[PDB]
Amino acid sequence: GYDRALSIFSPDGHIFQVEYALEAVKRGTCAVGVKGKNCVVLGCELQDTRITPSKVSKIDSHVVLSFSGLNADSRILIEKARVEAQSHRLTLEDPVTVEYLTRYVAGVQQRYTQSGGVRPFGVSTLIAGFDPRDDEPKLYQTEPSGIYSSWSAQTIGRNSKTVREFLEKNYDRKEPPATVEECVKLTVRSLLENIEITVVKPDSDIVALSSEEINQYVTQI
Amino acid sequence: GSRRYDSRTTIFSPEGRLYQVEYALESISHAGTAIGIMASDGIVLAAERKSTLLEQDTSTEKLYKLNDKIAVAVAGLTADAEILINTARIHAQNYLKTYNEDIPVEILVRRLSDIKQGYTQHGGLRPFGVSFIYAGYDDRYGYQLYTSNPSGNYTGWKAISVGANTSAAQTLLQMDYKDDMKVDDAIELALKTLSKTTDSSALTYDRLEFATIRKEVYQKIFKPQEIKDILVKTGIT
Amino acid sequence: GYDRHITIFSPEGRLYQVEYAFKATNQTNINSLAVRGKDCTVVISQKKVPDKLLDPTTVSYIFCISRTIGMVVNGPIPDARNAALRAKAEAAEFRYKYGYDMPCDVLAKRMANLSQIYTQRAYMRPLGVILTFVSVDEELGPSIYKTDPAGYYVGYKATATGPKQQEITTNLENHFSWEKVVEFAITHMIDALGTEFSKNDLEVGVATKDKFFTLSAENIEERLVAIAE
Amino acid sequence: DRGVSTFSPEGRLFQVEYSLEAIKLGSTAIGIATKEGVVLGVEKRATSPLLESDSIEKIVEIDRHIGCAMSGLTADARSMIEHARTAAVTHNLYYDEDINVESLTQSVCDLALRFGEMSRPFGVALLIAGHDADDGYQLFHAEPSGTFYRYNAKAIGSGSEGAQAELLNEWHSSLTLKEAELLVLKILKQVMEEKLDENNAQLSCITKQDGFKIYDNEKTAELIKEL
Amino acid sequence: GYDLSNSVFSPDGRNFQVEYAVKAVENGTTSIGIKCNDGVVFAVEKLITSKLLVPQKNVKIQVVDRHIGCVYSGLIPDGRHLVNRGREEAASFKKLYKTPIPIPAFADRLGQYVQAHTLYNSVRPFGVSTIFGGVDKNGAHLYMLEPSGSYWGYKGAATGKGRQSAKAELEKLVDHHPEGLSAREAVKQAAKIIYLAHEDNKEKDFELEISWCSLSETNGLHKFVKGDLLQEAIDFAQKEIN
Amino acid sequence: DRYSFSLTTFSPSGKLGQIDYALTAVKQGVTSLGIKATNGVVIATEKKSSSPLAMSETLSKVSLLTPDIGAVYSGMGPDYRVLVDKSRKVAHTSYKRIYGEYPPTKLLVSEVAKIMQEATQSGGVRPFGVSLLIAGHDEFNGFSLYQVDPSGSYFPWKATAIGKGSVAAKTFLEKRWNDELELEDAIHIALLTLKESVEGEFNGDTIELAIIGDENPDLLGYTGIPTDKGPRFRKLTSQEINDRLEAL
Amino acid sequence: TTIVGVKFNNGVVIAADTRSTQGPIVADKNCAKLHRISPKIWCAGAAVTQLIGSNIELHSLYTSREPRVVSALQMLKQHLFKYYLIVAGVDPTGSHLFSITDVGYYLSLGSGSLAAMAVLESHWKQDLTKEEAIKLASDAIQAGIWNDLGSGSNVDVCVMEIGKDAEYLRNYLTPNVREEKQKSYKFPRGTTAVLKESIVNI
Amino acid sequence: DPSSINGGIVVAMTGKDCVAIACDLRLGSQSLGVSNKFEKIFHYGHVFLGITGLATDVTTLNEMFRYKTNLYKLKEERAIEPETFTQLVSSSLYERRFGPYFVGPVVAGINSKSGKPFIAGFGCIDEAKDFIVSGTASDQLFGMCESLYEPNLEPEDLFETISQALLNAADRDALSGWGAVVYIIKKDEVVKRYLKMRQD
Amino acid sequence: NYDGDTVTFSPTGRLFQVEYALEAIKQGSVTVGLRSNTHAVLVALKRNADELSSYQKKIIKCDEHMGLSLAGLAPDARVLSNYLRQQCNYSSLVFNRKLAVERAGHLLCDKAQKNTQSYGGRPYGVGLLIIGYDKSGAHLLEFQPSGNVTELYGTAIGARSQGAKTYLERTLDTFIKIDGNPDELIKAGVEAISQSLRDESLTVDNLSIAIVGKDTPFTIYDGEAVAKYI
Numbered sequence A: 001g002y003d004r005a006l007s008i009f010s011p012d013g014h015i016f017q018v019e020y021a022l023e024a025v026k027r028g029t030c031a032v033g034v035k036g037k038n039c040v041v042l043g044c045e046l047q048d049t050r051i052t053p054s055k056v057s058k059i060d061s062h063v064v065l066s067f068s069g070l071n072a073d074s075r076i077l078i079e080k081a082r083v084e085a086q087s088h089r090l091t092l093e094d095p096v097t098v099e100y101l102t103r104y105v106a107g108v109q110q111r112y113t114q115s116g117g118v119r120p121f122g123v124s125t126l127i128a129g130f131d132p133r134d135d136e137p138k139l140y141q142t143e144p145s146g147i148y149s150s151w152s153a154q155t156i157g158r159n160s161k162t163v164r165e166f167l168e169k170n171y172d173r174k175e176p177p178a179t180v181e182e183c184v185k186l187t188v189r190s191l192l193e194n195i196e197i198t199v200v201k202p203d204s205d206i207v208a209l210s211s212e213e214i215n216q217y218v219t220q221i
Numbered sequence B: 001g002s003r004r005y006d007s008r009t010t011i012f013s014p015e016g017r018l019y020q021v022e023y024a025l026e027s028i029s030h031a032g033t034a035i036g037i038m039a040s041d042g043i044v045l046a047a048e049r050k051s052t053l054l055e056q057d058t059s060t061e062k063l064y065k066l067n068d069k070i071a072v073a074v075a076g077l078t079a080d081a082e083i084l085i086n087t088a089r090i091h092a093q094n095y096l097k098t099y100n101e102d103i104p105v106e107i108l109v110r111r112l113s114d115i116k117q118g119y120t121q122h123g124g125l126r127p128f129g130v131s132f133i134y135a136g137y138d139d140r141y142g143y144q145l146y147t148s149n150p151s152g153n154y155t156g157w158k159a160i161s162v163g164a165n166t167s168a169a170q171t172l173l174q175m176d177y178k179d180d181m182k183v184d185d186a187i188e189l190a191l192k193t194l195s196k197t198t199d200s201s202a203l204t205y206d207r208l209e210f211a212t213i214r215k216e217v218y219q220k221i222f223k224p225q226e227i228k229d230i231l232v233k234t235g236i237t
Numbered sequence C: 001g002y003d004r005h006i007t008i009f010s011p012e013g014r015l016y017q018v019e020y021a022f023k024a025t026n027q028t029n030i031n032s033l034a035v036r037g038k039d040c041t042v043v044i045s046q047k048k049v050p051d052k053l054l055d056p057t058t059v060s061y062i063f064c065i066s067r068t069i070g071m072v073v074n075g076p077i078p079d080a081r082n083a084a085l086r087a088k089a090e091a092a093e094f095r096y097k098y099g100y101d102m103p104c105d106v107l108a109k110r111m112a113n114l115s116q117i118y119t120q121r122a123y124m125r126p127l128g129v130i131l132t133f134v135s136v137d138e139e140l141g142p143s144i145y146k147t148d149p150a151g152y153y154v155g156y157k158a159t160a161t162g163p164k165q166q167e168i169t170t171n172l173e174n175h176f177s178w179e180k181v182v183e184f185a186i187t188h189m190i191d192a193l194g195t196e197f198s199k200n201d202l203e204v205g206v207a208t209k210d211k212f213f214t215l216s217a218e219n220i221e222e223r224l225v226a227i228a229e
Numbered sequence D: 001d002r003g004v005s006t007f008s009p010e011g012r013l014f015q016v017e018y019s020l021e022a023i024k025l026g027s028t029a030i031g032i033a034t035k036e037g038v039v040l041g042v043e044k045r046a047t048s049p050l051l052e053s054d055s056i057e058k059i060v061e062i063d064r065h066i067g068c069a070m071s072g073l074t075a076d077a078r079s080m081i082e083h084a085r086t087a088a089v090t091h092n093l094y095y096d097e098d099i100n101v102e103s104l105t106q107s108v109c110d111l112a113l114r115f116g117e118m119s120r121p122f123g124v125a126l127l128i129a130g131h132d133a134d135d136g137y138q139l140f141h142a143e144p145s146g147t148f149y150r151y152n153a154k155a156i157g158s159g160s161e162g163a164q165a166e167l168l169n170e171w172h173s174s175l176t177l178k179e180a181e182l183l184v185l186k187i188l189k190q191v192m193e194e195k196l197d198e199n200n201a202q203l204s205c206i207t208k209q210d211g212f213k214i215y216d217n218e219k220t221a222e223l224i225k226e227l
Numbered sequence E: 001g002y003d004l005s006n007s008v009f010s011p012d013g014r015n016f017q018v019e020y021a022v023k024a025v026e027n028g029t030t031s032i033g034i035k036c037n038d039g040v041v042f043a044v045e046k047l048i049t050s051k052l053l054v055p056q057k058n059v060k061i062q063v064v065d066r067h068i069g070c071v072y073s074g075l076i077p078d079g080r081h082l083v084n085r086g087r088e089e090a091a092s093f094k095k096l097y098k099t100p101i102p103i104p105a106f107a108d109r110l111g112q113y114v115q116a117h118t119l120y121n122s123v124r125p126f127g128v129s130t131i132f133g134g135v136d137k138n139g140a141h142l143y144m145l146e147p148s149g150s151y152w153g154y155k156g157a158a159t160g161k162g163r164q165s166a167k168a169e170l171e172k173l174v175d176h177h178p179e180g181l182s183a184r185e186a187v188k189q190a191a192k193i194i195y196l197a198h199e200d201n202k203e204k205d206f207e208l209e210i211s212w213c214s215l216s217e218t219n220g221l222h223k224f225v226k227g228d229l230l231q232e233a234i235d236f237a238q239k240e241i242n
Numbered sequence F: 001d002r003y004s005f006s007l008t009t010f011s012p013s014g015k016l017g018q019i020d021y022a023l024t025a026v027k028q029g030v031t032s033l034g035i036k037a038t039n040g041v042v043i044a045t046e047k048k049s050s051s052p053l054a055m056s057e058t059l060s061k062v063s064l065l066t067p068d069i070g071a072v073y074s075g076m077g078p079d080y081r082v083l084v085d086k087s088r089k090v091a092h093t094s095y096k097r098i099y100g101e102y103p104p105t106k107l108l109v110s111e112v113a114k115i116m117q118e119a120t121q122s123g124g125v126r127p128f129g130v131s132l133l134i135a136g137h138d139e140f141n142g143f144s145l146y147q148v149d150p151s152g153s154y155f156p157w158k159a160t161a162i163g164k165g166s167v168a169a170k171t172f173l174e175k176r177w178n179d180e181l182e183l184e185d186a187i188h189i190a191l192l193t194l195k196e197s198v199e200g201e202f203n204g205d206t207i208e209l210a211i212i213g214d215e216n217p218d219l220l221g222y223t224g225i226p227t228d229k230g231p232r233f234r235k236l237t238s239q240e241i242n243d244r245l246e247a248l
Numbered sequence G: 001t002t003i004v005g006v007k008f009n010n011g012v013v014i015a016a017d018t019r020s021t022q023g024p025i026v027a028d029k030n031c032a033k034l035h036r037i038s039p040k041i042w043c044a045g046a047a048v049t050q051l052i053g054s055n056i057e058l059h060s061l062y063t064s065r066e067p068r069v070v071s072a073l074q075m076l077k078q079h080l081f082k083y084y085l086i087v088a089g090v091d092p093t094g095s096h097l098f099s100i101t102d103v104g105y106y107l108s109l110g111s112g113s114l115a116a117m118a119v120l121e122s123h124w125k126q127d128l129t130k131e132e133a134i135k136l137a138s139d140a141i142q143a144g145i146w147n148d149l150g151s152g153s154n155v156d157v158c159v160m161e162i163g164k165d166a167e168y169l170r171n172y173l174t175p176n177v178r179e180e181k182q183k184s185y186k187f188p189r190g191t192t193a194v195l196k197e198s199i200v201n202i
Numbered sequence H: 001d002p003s004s005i006n007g008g009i010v011v012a013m014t015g016k017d018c019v020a021i022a023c024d025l026r027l028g029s030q031s032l033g034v035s036n037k038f039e040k041i042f043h044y045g046h047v048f049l050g051i052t053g054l055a056t057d058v059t060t061l062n063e064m065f066r067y068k069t070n071l072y073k074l075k076e077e078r079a080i081e082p083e084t085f086t087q088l089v090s091s092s093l094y095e096r097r098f099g100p101y102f103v104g105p106v107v108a109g110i111n112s113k114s115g116k117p118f119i120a121g122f123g124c125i126d127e128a129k130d131f132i133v134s135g136t137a138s139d140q141l142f143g144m145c146e147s148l149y150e151p152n153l154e155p156e157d158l159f160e161t162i163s164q165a166l167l168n169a170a171d172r173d174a175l176s177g178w179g180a181v182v183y184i185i186k187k188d189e190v191v192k193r194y195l196k197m198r199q200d
Numbered sequence I: 001n002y003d004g005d006t007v008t009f010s011p012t013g014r015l016f017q018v019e020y021a022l023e024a025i026k027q028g029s030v031t032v033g034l035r036s037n038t039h040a041v042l043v044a045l046k047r048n049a050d051e052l053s054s055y056q057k058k059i060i061k062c063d064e065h066m067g068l069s070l071a072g073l074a075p076d077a078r079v080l081s082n083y084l085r086q087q088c089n090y091s092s093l094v095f096n097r098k099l100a101v102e103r104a105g106h107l108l109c110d111k112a113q114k115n116t117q118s119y120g121g122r123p124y125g126v127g128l129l130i131i132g133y134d135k136s137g138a139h140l141l142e143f144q145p146s147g148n149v150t151e152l153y154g155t156a157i158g159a160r161s162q163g164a165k166t167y168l169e170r171t172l173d174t175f176i177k178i179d180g181n182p183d184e185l186i187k188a189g190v191e192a193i194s195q196s197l198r199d200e201s202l203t204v205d206n207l208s209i210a211i212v213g214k215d216t217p218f219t220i221y222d223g224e225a226v227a228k229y230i
Helices: A016-026 A071-092 A098-112 A160-170 A180-191 A211-220 B019-028 B078-099 B105-121 B166-176 B183-195 B224-234 C016-024 C077-098 C104-120 C165-175 C178-193 C217-228 D014-023 D074-095 D101-109 D160-170 D177-191 D217-225 E016-026 E076-096 E103-116 E163-176 E183-201 E228-241 F017-027 F077-099 F105-121 F166-176 F183-197 F238-246 G048-063 G069-082 G113-123 G130-147 H055-076 H082-094 H138-148 H155-171 I016-026 I074-095 I101-117 I161-175 I182-194
Strands: A030-035 A040-044 A063-069 A123-129 A138-142 A148-150 A153-157 A196-201 A205-208 B034-038 B042-048 B063-065 B070-076 B130-138 B142-148 B154-157 B159-162 B208-214 B218-221 C032-036 C041-046 C062-064 C070-074 C130-137 C141-147 C153-156 C158-161 C202-207 C212-214 D029-033 D038-043 D059-063 D066-072 D124-132 D136-142 D148-150 D153-156 D201-207 D211-214 E031-035 E039-047 E062-064 E068-074 E128-136 E139-145 E151-153 E156-159 E206-214 E222-224 F032-036 F041-046 F063-066 F069-075 F130-138 F142-148 F154-156 F159-162 F207-212 F233-235 G002-008 G011-017 G020-022 G025-028 G034-038 G041-045 G085-091 G094-099 G106-110 G155-161 G166-173 G194-200 H009-014 H019-024 H027-029 H032-035 H041-044 H047-053 H103-110 H117-120 H131-135 H180-185 H190-195 I031-035 I039-045 I059-061 I066-072 I126-134 I137-143 I149-151 I154-157 I207-213 I216-221
Touching (some): A016 A123, A030 A063, A030 A123, A030 A180, A040 A063, A040 A123, A063 A071, A071 A098, A071 A123, A098 A123, A098 A138, A098 A148, A123 A153, A138 A153, A180 A196, A180 A211, A196 A211, B019 B130, B034 B070, B034 B130, B034 B142, B042 B070, B042 B130, B042 B183, B063 B208, B063 B218, B078 H055, B105 B130, B105 B142, B105 B154, B142 B159, B183 B208, B183 B224, B208 B224, C032 C070, C032 C178, C041 C070, C041 C130, C041 C141, C041 C178, C070 C077, C070 C202, C077 C104, C077 E103, C077 G069, C104 C130, C104 C141, C104 C153, C130 C202, C141 C158, C158 C165, C178 C202, C178 C217, C202 C217, D014 D066, D029 D124, D029 D160, D029 D177, D038 D066, D038 D124, D038 D177, D059 D211, D066 D074, D074 D101, D074 D124, D101 D124, D124 D153, D136 D153, D153 D160, D160 D177, D177 D201, D177 D217, E016 E128, E031 E068, E031 E163, E031 E183, E039 E068, E039 E128, E039 E139, E039 E183, E068 E076, E068 E206, E076 E103, E076 E128, E076 I101, E103 E128, E103 E139, E103 E151, E128 E206, E139 E156, E163 E183, E206 E228, F017 F130, F032 F142, F032 F166, F032 F183, F041 F069, F041 F142, F041 F183, F063 F130, F063 F233, F069 F207, F069 F233, F077 F105, F077 F130, F077 G048, F077 H082, F105 F130, F105 F142, F130 F207, F159 F166, F159 F183, F166 F183, F183 F207, G002 G041, G002 G085, G002 G094, G002 G113, G002 G130, G011 G041, G011 G085, G011 G094, G034 G155, G034 G166, G041 G155, G069 G085, G069 G094, G085 G155, G106 G113, G113 G130, G130 G155, G130 G166, H009 H047, H009 H103, H009 H138, H009 H155, H019 H041, H041 H055, H041 H180, H047 H055, H047 H082, H047 H131, H055 H082, H082 H117, H138 H155, I016 I066, I031 I066, I031 I137, I031 I182, I039 I066, I039 I137, I059 I207, I059 I216, I066 I074, I066 I216, I074 I101, I101 I126, I101 I137, I126 I207, I137 I154, I161 I182, I182 I207
Antiparallel strands (some): A030 A040, A030 A153, A040 A196, A063 A123, A123 A138, A138 A148, A196 A205, B034 B042, B034 B159, B042 B208, B063 B070, B142 B154, B208 B218, C032 C041, C032 C158, C041 C202, C062 C070, C070 C130, C141 C153, C202 C212, D029 D038, D038 D201, D059 D066, D066 D124, D201 D211, E031 E039, E031 E156, E039 E206, E068 E128, E139 E151, E206 E222, F032 F041, F063 F069, F069 F130, F130 F142, G002 G011, G034 G041, G041 G085, G085 G094, G194 H190, H009 H019, H009 H131, H019 H180, H027 H032, H041 H047, H047 H103, I031 I039, I031 I154, I039 I207, I059 I066, I126 I137, I137 I149
16 A cells, blocks of 8 residues: 655645645635625636536535535545535434534545645635524635634635635625625625625525526626 | 655645646647537547558547447547546446446546546556547436546536647637537538648548447447548548 | 666666676676486586585585476575575475476476566565576476576576686587486586586586486595596 | 654654644643643634634633643644544543543543654644643643643743743742633733734633633633733 | 665675675674584673673573574674574474474574565665574584575684684684584683684673583583583683683 | 555656656567468567577467467567466456457457556556567457557557567568468568568577467367367467478 | 266276256256366366366466376366366376276266266276277266166267377267157147237347 | 245247247236236347346346446447357356356347357256246246247247247246247347236 | 665664664663662653653553663653553463563563664664562663663663763672662662762652562652652
């Protein structure tokens, strides 16, 4: 078995492979997530649109996962997340909470940063959804190092710093977007600095907005 | 120990890239051009071979059947491709054994791309130097045209080219492709793109591999005479 | 830069570590020659024992692989003993699996295939020895098969190994009971190397129809006396 | 390159010395042990205003009377905490008794040097605080080098160099718990780059009666006013 | 640049790591072996690095089974590693068969093990040369095994720092006594040779350790030379200096 | 074995260096050629002897893989020897145990090339330094001639040459090959092509030639089974080669 | 089943009956029980043959030597011991006859073994010729055919001579050909009632 | 004995340039009849396979042989022949020597090259030239086939012969019946016929 | 070029990774061992990271009859002491026999040597002084990372251990004949370790003493228990 330590500390205390895995994420496309009072809206800015997968993926009926970075690496994380969500139902009789799913995904990413013979995932994920029988929105983020945290609004990918700067002044944690329209319009405005929108609502009510709806938001802005 | 001789294939560059994957994509860029065109009534796979004494009528080096409804065009190392093609054939037959249904095209493409990605993240081995074009039919989406590369990324296309002169071929495809062409029109577009992207002075039947999938779905990998027939009527002759 | 340290190809298509294992075959500075009679195969090997503290009966580069097969090795004795132990296990295993004694050529191919693996797998280095197998095969008669660090083996009418293997080889080329065959090989080694041998300077192995055996210092002196007469 | 388990000519493992400098970049964690309990305080260090700081768990519960702070690569901490929690739970299963704090610190530190071709040592340092009948209120500093010491007062992280000197001046054996709360907040306010408040700092305490408790933003705010 | 790995041939065909392992052996203390007419005598110089060493307690010579004695120079932990393998190997022979392992058979088993440590770069060559031998059904045998895995039978053997002077004295012993030395008298010369070899390491004091395995004196079993015979050899060695 | 990583990797130009260096070894090897006729295939090579005292009869550069399939090589002989052993084994375990018959030529060639590709991607192994010309007959495809490269790529040929004089020989084969060639004509062309590549003596002892042709019931070793045909692979003896060289 | 093996002055002959039974029911009336391991090594039993023969062929290609009956015997013996045959043949060391292990100048196995051994014990003599050996081996099989219910139909004979090719005499004797039936039972067309008829697209 | 759990019979016959394969349709659970549409005859290209025995094994083997003959066609670029398929069946069955499927397979087909009709029974191959029977009524089928069969029957006559043999053997078997299907296989066409029989 | 792995010899025959592991002990706090015929004494100078911190445990108890003290990497000492406890435990289980001190040292000898000849591991960065009492009497053993285990009357390992070791050699003829007066043997150990101090003096928190003997089970003195010996 190949077990070379690929992720090791540099003399300055840095793990270069994890640092370079983050660079792979920053070259990913987009994942803007705006959490509101009742909404979590996820968005991204000769190809066959029917069969090209949407970036937002349902891990379970109530939890969806968007990502940024290496698409091929993300499929492996999403597959492991879906298997775990089913196993938790199978053995603990309950669907996963958003934090439990986030903890498992970040655990796999952390495991790949200190296992021999493997490189870290070049994937950062935005995990959004609702805990079972619950209604307060959750919006978590994971990174290649394994760090996971909860956000009111977050972006990952190219132009993340510009969009996060835009979010940090248009989003106010004093008064989150009260209406689903405000959740989408803020998300579209951030993505306007092509638009896909997915709205995550309690009781497994996850819907992707149509292009006609998105056009109305864009035209309004 | 062997640590001094390890090339560290599965590591990131400081720019976030994977050297071996990028070097494997550079390898395919010198391989023969393979083109896939998804028409309204089917898909067209066309590949340019890359000698007088070569047994051309027997050589099948770029187009392979994976199924009764799925075929692949190959760009890159043919020996590496034969390994992946065998697994795809077994995986498609495993799906039919489990569910009594023909495997969906995307499920097969995803499984093959997951094998490619695995060689990119762990194991210490080099990536497969192969790019595929999957032309397939299933009852869910109908005619589907996918492509996959050594990194394990796969994307669906209406028209796509892999191998040498991909940029030139895609420019021609963008100009001349319509969503409502028929297979015969799609066939014609395939040879013109190959003719205007080949490095040789002329395009002849011995340098070509051709395959179509048409509706029940029927896979036809063209014989040299049939390529010769379609070559003349297209006008390239 | 590391193509010279493990058995991978150089830009010229060469395996330098295999070529350097050939250089290791001549460190002992011992010359050996094998000749076939019509009934017997004879190996003559130089026996150089410079240290007077050595027990000469232990210094030996000729091994009895089986009842009928003998092996003479050119190269360091730890690698020589490694190959000898492997050849003995192969010979015994063949007899167990197939019910009859392994032929000399099958064993030579058997050991050449092992050397081929060291040539292709990076974690195994080549053994720096050349193995000459001799026997009287029940089908092919007297036989000489020589293996090298490259995994290459071939049968020989006669053969010589060592630093002066060329001088012995052309000497055999010009020319081209087992006691006479022994007396021929000793004489031709004296002429080729230009050095008279005492009974302590030579190792002699004789492959006959029923057994392979090595002559003692008394037996070698008997042959030296016969050459004197 | 060089092997991960290599010694330097001075007798120190290269990866351990490199891992220790990763801790110096972490958020500050401060712990003070008194006769009435142990107070643990951490610098939250939220990277963005949109980041929900209440989700930053830099003080965790290991057992009912054992808690710890973390500083450095806090992703490595969760694996160490999960092992610590399992060890505390496994002790109660095998011995029908709560694990000792020093024994819990030993179980964690057994993982520290179990790396080589684990690819690397952990890049996180813990301040383990706990109470038991055998030794009372105890505070330990677990390092990736495998060494740990019992501390009356200890500060780890980016501001540890200045905080520890201040802890030297201020600690005495007669400190009450509320003094320790103020002392931890005082030193945190001194070393944090941000202006200290209930949203960018966290407090926790371990007592025999109430066990391991993390102070709410409300209760911390009242304690912050007292300064 | 061919000396950084164990299993690498230099362009001349040499293994430099094995040659470097020999340099470790030449740095060790002098150990000798003398094959007498019916047994083998082993002697070793034990350097007294400090006065705090417990006398006659840091034993260097090791027994394998009951009839094989082993002494080595260089990296003592490597020699103990080799003897541990030899004891496992002598036992496995005594289980499959019933006789105690023959000395030539034992020599090959150790030689294969030492040679196997030169085959891969993941392992280090042994940093010892072992003088070993004993009495079996075919008489007395004496072997010296080098880090390359090479071993030969010897009438007399020596390794360590004072190996050159010890070899000169052992050669005189072989020259002066073609009839074959006696076991008791060989013990005295073993003391004499070790004391003579110590002049190359006179900067520190040394303790003499002798063991023997004789068909007549020790009934074919390996025993340490202690008590009156040990002191008698020391007096003979001390007298023979002057 | 600590070598679990690939020793063959991509270069920044996309080349696989160990494969290119393995191909260099083949080009430095002795010239071997194959010609496919209407009623047979002929594979021929030079037997280069290391010593005049070596018994070149013992070294067979042409090997029977199955009764109807034979192989010749250029490059590292020991690599070919172990490939032939693996090819013969795979022809039984992978095909003949399952279907009760020997594989068709293209299926054996793909199995041989699979072994070669594995040495290209597996950890701790260099590629094989041989190209093989594999000649065979099967009931449905007739006679075929395949070249297998160290990378694992294989191609069907009407006629081809590999080795030291492959470039010159392939030019000569282009002039002489035609789709109406008979096996005896192919053998004659093969000997002429090998004549221009052999440096020293050109005779039955320095030349190894084999054919895939008619079934040989005389080489079957038993009678009484009408459906057992007899091997099509036949190595020509030194006397036979000399006869065709005397009347050349 | 009746299998015999008889050695004669220049080889060995094996013979067998061709009846296969599933209980009291004759499944195959012309089963071939003489199995070829190698061109001159043949086996008969009262899968292991197709695997031993495969490895014998591979071993013969590896060693470039003719297969030996001891090698087949050793392989069969080791394989069967890991988890009842007559192995005969001619190799460069001569003709051999084994059972699985005992050698013999004549052997018999199967349900008709005792009947066959009776004929062998009665008529076998040293230095048989090839024609006499075939006659003796055939009469032994015929005895099993007439007297043993488990044996019947035809006699298959394989003759392995030292300097010659092995000759497999499939259905050497056919002493049980059915007589012509009293009546022909060809039904007139349309006799069978058909509910549905359809062409199958293969 | 798991073969008698489900019942059912398969018979194959050779004619003049044609083969016939026939089976009953009863799927039973001991005495209880479950399904009358359990066809035990399958084809892979132009090679037909009848499987008697345990029904779950019949489904498992058909899926396995559809698996293997598909990979054969992809690898070989040609359809498998009845003689090659017989070897494939034989090796597949002995691949589970100590875990055997409780089946009796019957191969029927015409070799596409030689044009000669081929039938086979079984791991040990019974390549008969006249007829192969399998199932619970094999003894009844042997009696009927041995009496009715004559060589070189035309396809029309072969249909009547194999039908009457099947119907009358099924009438005397408790676990066979509930309908019957006959395949008259020629090189150019394959005819499938359902027989009228007693439904008890 | 030759110090990057324990599997490499230097051109002069040296093992640099082993020597670098030896340097780890010289960076550690001094611990002194000495013995008479009846008693063996461990004297250790415990080291504290900070004056707000406690002093690291230097002496480990194996069982009633044997214990050790460490200098260097503490996690390595625990690994070795755990292995030593397993060996002593095995002897009691399978033979009802107390493991001899000399035999226990050779088991540490073999375990330490395996990390100096095989790739992947590292030499233990700790030195140990093992005291024990068995049928042969009092025993003091010095363990080194190179695998060398030595039986001594007295010894010192750690930083500035030469001052203690020089004193023990000068006092050698005295303390070996102390015999059945354990407090005077402990006193001689405390004077030796006081010869290795540079700036700090022996305090109640600094000093740690262990003893084992004929009718003395292995006991460790810490805190006020050592105030009579300071």
